[PDB]
Design a protein around this nucleic acid. Sequence first.
RNA 1: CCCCCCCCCCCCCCCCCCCCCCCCCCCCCCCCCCCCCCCCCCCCCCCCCCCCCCCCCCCCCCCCCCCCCCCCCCCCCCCC
Length: 225
Amino acid sequence: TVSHEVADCSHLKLTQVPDDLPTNITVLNLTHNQLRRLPAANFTRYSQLTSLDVGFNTISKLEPELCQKLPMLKVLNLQHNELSQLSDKTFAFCTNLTELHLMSNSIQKIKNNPFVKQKNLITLDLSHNGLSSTKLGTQVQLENLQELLLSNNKIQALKSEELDIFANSSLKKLELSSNQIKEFSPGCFHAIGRLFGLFLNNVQLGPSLTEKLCLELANTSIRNL
RNA sequence: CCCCCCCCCCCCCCCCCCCCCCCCCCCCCCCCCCCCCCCCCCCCCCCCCCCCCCCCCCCCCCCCCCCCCCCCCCCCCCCC
């Protein structure tokens, strides 16, 4: 685990996090490991981190006390894990995050409300998940959100009520690639506050569905398609 | 030569309630085993593409060297 300012533990087959590192480290990387559990009790010493890349590992579920100890954590990477369950208190105490990757966690459904308790989030990733609807909450949140990725999901319909959350959000990227959406609801994109870019790569529309898509983009601020 | 009415004690049967003890079924939680699917760690094997390295072979170019063939010149000498 070589580290001078950047802490790297890539491809080192770690089972538990190390406990001998400088306190003032900002980024700590443990990609490509098998941290089966990530206890919060081992991070008493680690309280000055900003980015935490713990992706490509085998974490089952997370605890609220993990980011209690981190008041300055800003990047939280959970790529290729088993975090299939989310709760209101999963990301409650930590709200300074501006980056949150959840690619390939086999997330099935968003139950009630995982993302109100943060307002400074910028980029949200939900690629390679089992989501079938774009509903991520009940009320309106993610005011400062700009980047949203939902590629390689199992979404077949893009309903207007599913995007009522983003009535006051400026979104520059809606990554909905590799999802077999076959129905478009009126006002689905008008519910979005500020839509700037739509990405529908590898998605089977056809000419008629493309025409309906363009009709649904009437009177909006889209820049890229 | 008889019936009736009171009372004690002990029975038997029947309905209700409360106890233990057990059986069957079911619920909840936990453990073990088997099967299916998925993720990650490595160490890899096979195939294709791309890039280089060595050696070698064919063809070509350039510079030659030797030999053969042809032509010209210089000097010397004869024939009529």
